[PDB]
Design a protein around this ligand. Structure first.
Ligand SMILES: *[C@@H]1O[C@H](CO)[C@@H](O)[C@H](O)[C@H]1NC(C)=O
Ligand SMILES: [Cl-]
Length: 349
């Protein structure tokens, strides 16, 4: 019972290199719950940048390497030991082969992230999704941000198509970033050197990216990049969204030009890092369903050890279960208050 690969029938919706996009599916006929997972793994924001990603990470720009089956992990696992509350769900894994944070709507690379999602949903309706009660759009890293950019379009899509009983919800893991100033400025030459703001501004135009309608209308024409930042887009969303976010996300630190060795940390950097945690906590204050441990890490929800981390005595699977119950003792808002990564003893290594 692996998830099984299906390539999109509309052959014009493609990965970056023109190969067909697709999705992996494990059906569970007794369940009315669907979990659609968006894979993450950075992005590229211009031709030179994508060329470089093509040479070091070709698998994220193509379908040509995808095996026909894959075993679900963490929240996609069918083993109750690994997924105690959601193991019986219908499981969908959408691989990330568009390098556009799932926003693309476009010789050259194609960027069709948002179209891919639109198309997957359409096809899943013929494979059981039409009888769903709950559709959880989940994602890690770029896929996390992707949830925030697409969850309401999916809700609108299903309503337009005549399926108003499906409850669409979001689960965004490691996709909630701050468009902050770097620790030390560096010119936008790479993907790792590049300030969060500049990466996206460049990317959006290069991808023909789209953002949620209501977030689009909150910023000026051409300033759609704002909606890539969770704390700005979140209040515009209608679907309920659970935000999982490490307080000291490695990708956040990377774009902030912070490169931790094993060494003692300098004064300037202790203030920076600590202030990052503080600002992140502040943005989460407004999010009623969240799980934000004080750890230095990146992604969690499809890692097999996702059951191990705890905030205030509650595990992440249990927090999500408590969130299911709240939408149908059991806390849903779980933010570490301690000021430095690994002050929580259940952090992974
Ligand atoms: C197939 O996908 C392309 C690319 O997005 C789209 O423009 C076209 O309308 C689609 N065709 C059908 C029949 O849906
Ligand atoms: Cl098959």
């Amino acid at each position: 019972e692996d998830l099984r690969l299906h390539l999109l029938l509309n052959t014009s919706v493609t990965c970056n290199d023109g190969s067909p996009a697709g999705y992996y599916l494990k059906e569970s006929r007794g369940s009315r719950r669907w979990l659609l997972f968006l894979e993450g793994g950075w992005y590229c924001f211009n031709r030179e940048n994508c060329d470089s990603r093509y040479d070091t990470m070709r698998r994220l720009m193509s379908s040509r390497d995808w095996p026909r089956t894959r075993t679900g992990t963490g929240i996609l696992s069918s083993q109750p030991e690994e997924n105690p509350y959601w193991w019986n769900a219908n499981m969908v894994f959408i691989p990330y082969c568009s390098s556009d944070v799932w926003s693309g709507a476009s010789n050259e690379y194609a960027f069709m992230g948002a179209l891919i999602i639109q198309e997957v949903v359409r096809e899943l309706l013929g494979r059981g999704l039409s009888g769903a009660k709950v559709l959880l759009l989940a994602g890690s890293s770029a896929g996390g941000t992707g949830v925030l950019l697409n969850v309401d379009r999916v809700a609108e899509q299903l309503e337009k198509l005549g399926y108003p009983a499906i409850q669409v919800r979001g689960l965004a893991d490691s996709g909630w970033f701050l468009d902050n100033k770097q620790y030390r400025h560096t010119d936008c030459v790479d993907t790792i050197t590049c300030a969060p703001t500049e990466a996206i501004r460049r990317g959006i135009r290069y991808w023909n990216g789209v953002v949620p309608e209501r977030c689009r209308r909150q910023f000026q024409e051409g300033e759609e990049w704002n909606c890539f930042f969770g704390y700005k887009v979140y209040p515009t969303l209608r679907s309920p969204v659970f935000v999982v976010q490490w307080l000291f996300d490695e990708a956040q630190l990377t774009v902030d030009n912070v490169h931790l060795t094993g060494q003692p940390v300098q004064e300037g950097l202790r203030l920076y890092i600590q202030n990052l945690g503080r600002e992140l906590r502040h943005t989460l204050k407004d999010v009623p369903a969240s799980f934000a441990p004080a750890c230095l890490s990146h992604e969690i929800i499809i890692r097999s050890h996702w059951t191990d981390v705890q905030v205030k005595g509650t595990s992440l699977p249990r927090a999500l279960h408590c969130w299911d119950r709240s939408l149908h003792g059991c806390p849903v808002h779980l933010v570490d208050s301690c000021p430095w990564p690994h002050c929580n003893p259940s952090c992974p290594t």
